[PDB]
Amino acid sequence: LDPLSETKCTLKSFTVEKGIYQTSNFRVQPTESIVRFPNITNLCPFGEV
Amino acid sequence: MTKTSVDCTMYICGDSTECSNLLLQYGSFCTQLNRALTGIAVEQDKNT
Structure with a gap:
């Protein structure tokens, strides 16, 4: 849910002392998954078959 | 000394x-390492 419930997870303790506490590392969402082949030039002349 | 973040x-x-399954299924060694590097960081805040 909550950054502070997560710090409490990190503490293992209910109880929180004054300070600042490093919990996790944030993490930037993937987007727009892309596969981009190059300019296409010279393909089979299948009609010749 | 340089205070890192990892x-x-x-x-x-x-x-x-x-x-992450394989690691939590390996343990929490990275966690001990983070505590080590926070201890460094505080030690040299304190040093300064």
Whole structure:
């Protein structure tokens, strides 16, 4: 849910002392998954078959 | 000394939830390492 419930997870303790506490590392969402082949030039002349 | 910050896991594999299973299924060694590097960081805040 909550950054502070997560710090409490990190503490293992209910109880929180004054300070600042490093919990996790944030993490930037993937987007727009892309596969981009190059300019296409010279393909089979299948009609010749 | 330089006070680091480390995104341990993502170095440890880099964006694989499958990994994270394998790591929590390996333990919490990266966690001990983070505590070590926070202890460094406070030690040299204190040193300064």
